[PDB]
Amino acid sequence: GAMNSSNYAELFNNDIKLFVDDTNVYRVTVHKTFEGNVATKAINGCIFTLNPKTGHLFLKIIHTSVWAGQKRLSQLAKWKTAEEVSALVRSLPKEEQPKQIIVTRKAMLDPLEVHMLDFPNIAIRPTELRLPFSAAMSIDKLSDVVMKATEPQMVLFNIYDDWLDRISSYTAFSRLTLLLRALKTNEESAKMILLSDPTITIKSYHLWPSFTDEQWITIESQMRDLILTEYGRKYNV
Amino acid sequence: MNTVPFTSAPIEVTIGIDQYSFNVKENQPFHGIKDIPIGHVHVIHFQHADNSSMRYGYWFDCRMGNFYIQYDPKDGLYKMMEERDGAKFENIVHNFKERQMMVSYPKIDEDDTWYNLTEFVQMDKIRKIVRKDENQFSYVDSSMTTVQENELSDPAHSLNYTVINFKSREAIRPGHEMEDFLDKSYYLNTVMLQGIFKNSSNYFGELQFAFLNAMFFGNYGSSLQWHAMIELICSSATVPKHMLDKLDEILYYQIKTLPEQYSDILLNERVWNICLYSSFQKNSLHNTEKIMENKYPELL
Numbered sequence: 001g002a003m004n005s006s007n008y009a010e011l012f013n014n015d016i017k018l019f020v021d022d023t024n025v026y027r028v029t030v031h032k033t034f035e036g037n038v039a040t041k042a043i044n045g046c047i048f049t050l051n052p053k054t055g056h057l058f059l060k061i062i063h064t065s066v067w068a069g070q071k072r073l074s075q076l077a078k079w080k081t082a083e084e085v086s087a088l089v090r091s092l093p094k095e096e097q098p099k100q101i102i103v104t105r106k107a108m109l110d111p112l113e114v115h116m117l118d119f120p121n122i123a124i125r126p127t128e129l130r131l132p133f134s135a136a137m138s139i140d141k142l143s144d145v146v147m148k149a150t151e152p153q154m155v156l157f158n159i160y161d162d163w164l165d166r167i168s169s170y171t172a173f174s175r176l177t178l179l180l181r182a183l184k185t186n187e188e189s190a191k192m193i194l195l196s197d198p199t200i201t202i203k204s205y206h207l208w209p210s211f212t213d214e215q216w217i218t219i220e221s222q223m224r225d226l227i228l229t230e231y232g233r234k235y236n237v
Numbered sequence: 238m239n240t241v242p243f244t245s246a247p248i249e250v251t252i253g254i255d256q257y258s259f260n261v262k263e264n265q266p267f268h269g270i271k272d273i274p275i276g277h278v279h280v281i282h283f284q285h286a287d288n289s290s291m292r293y294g295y296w297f298d299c300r301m302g303n304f305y306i307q308y309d310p311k312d313g314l315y316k317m318m319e320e321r322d323g324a325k326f327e328n329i330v331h332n333f334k335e336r337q338m339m340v341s342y343p344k345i346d347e348d349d350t351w352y353n354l355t356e357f358v359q360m361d362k363i364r365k366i367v368r369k370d371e372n373q374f375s376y377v378d379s380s381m382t383t384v385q386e387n388e389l390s391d392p393a394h395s396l397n398y399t400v401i402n403f404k405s406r407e408a409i410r411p412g413h414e415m416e417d418f419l420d421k422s423y424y425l426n427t428v429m430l431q432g433i434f435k436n437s438s439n440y441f442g443e444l445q446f447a448f449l450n451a452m453f454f455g456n457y458g459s460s461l462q463w464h465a466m467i468e469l470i471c472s473s474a475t476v477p478k479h480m481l482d483k484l485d486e487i488l489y490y491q492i493k494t495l496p497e498q499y500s501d502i503l504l505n506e507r508v509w510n511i512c513l514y515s516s517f518q519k520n521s522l523h524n525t526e527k528i529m530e531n532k533y534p535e536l537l
């Protein structure tokens with residue numbers, strides 16, 4: 001069934017599952033033409049496919065070339081997403097294939113189900129959660145590999161960096177969601193917080209700064225102030 | 238014209254013949270139905286006065302034998318049976334006609350309704366959906382489940398409709414996942430029409446038979462089958478012009494004949510709005526859409 005507040009710990013059990021988010025697959029800028037009409041220019045996008053237990057991110061870069069000569073791009077994007085997740089699963093050894101795939105938008109259920117007919121024992125689930133994975137393009141390194149790509153490409157990142165050496169997947173997921181929620185609500189502040197202290201560095205193959213345990217609790221606190229605050233500035237409370 | 242005599246009417250029952258029905262009281266002197274038009278299939282069906290649960294009946298074609306009804310007090314229902322002694326049958330019928338204890342199939346001469354509901358329905362195909370080969374007639378009731386319903390429990394009592402499933406490997410060609418799912422023309426024209434049904438007439442006869450089982454017995458899986466066969470045509474961008482034109486006539490008479498007050502259970506909001514307003518054929522069902530809008534504008 002659907003994934004929600006109540007069956008949330010299932011993400012951290014030992015059954016392999018992937019989250020799929022398709023919100024950054026099809027991306028455009030909107031501009032005016034010489035005749036004063038409006039047109040879109042596509043830019044590179046990406047499929048966000050995440051193992052929430054291990055932190056494995058199978059970032060498939062969607063190059064603008066996949067749209068050339070296509071119609072109805074918003075709909076094509078959902079089938080293209082499903083084509084790529086299916087290809088990923090197929091490329092995986094049996095013991096590494098997910099038992100479940102959870103899509104973050106219900107529009108992805110039918111495309112993925114149809115592309116995964118060959119895998120009847122993989123459950124395709126929706127979720128009731130309003131997860132902030134769209135803000136993945138507010139992570140500098142991820143946005144950078146996407147924008148620089150000149151061809152279709154699959155890049156790997158551990159979105160948890162090295163965190164699991166010290167904390168559990170449940171805690172790691174909670175940290176990630178808080179950071180992404182912050183980045184989504186106020187990208188400028190969120191980033192200001194993360195990078196205020198020049199001495200804290202980001203490791204070449206990491207995404208986030210190398211905070212000590214104590215520095216993460218402060219950061220996490222400041223991201224929570226951010227998310228409450230922007231809620232006030234938005235709702236006047 | 239043909240006759241289906243009854244031995245007697247021991248229990249109060251509403252008897253139906255095609256789209257006509259009449260009440261018979263317990264032990265009322267009733268010996269059957271005469272003047273039944275040759276050349277069509279028919280259905281005679283029953284709802285006991287005491288158990289509105291279980292409607293039940295027999296699909297039959299008089300050209301294939303002499304058939305009669307006899308109450309069975311052990312099994313508690315009206316059973317169709319075949320009389321093989323042709324002389325004993327003409328004999329029984331002629332007496333009952335002489336004593337005028339038979340109701341007359343009450344066909345108005347202007348009315349092509351039954352013909353248009355059963356245009357493509359053959360007994361040979363009915364007997365493949367309802368398997369009971371020792372009899373020439375076919376028993377259906379309200380509660381019989383379909384082969385596809387049994388996939389998702391007694392197989393001898395199943396309705397063996399052709400399984401349609403829009404999210405199945407049969408429906409979806411590897412590599413055409415989006416194309417085939419958004420435009421089911423392959424599934425309709427190649428898998429089902431060319432492959433399983435062979436021609437549009439056999440497809441339309443199953444469709445029509447599913448509708449009638451839904452209408453007359455409230456058979457839920459028949460209703461599911463009728464809506465699926467409609468939806469596959471409406472969701473195909475490429476349909477022979479002749480199939481569309483006939484479809485519009487087929488569905489027009491089904492909608493016209495449906496009981497006004499049963500429409501809320503037998504008609505699937507999603508399929509009809511999709512077929513009439515969103516699907517590739519939204520512009521190809523003029524008669525069906527006109528009658529749907531003037532009769533059931535609520536469902537839309």
Ligand SMILES: NC[C@@H]1CCCC[C@H]1CN1CCC[C@@H]1O
Nearest residue numbers: 055056057058092096156157158
């Ligand atoms: N994000 C890095 C991951 C671990 C190390 C490098 C590759 C992936 C491995 N994943 C998990 C198994 C299937 C897939 O190949």
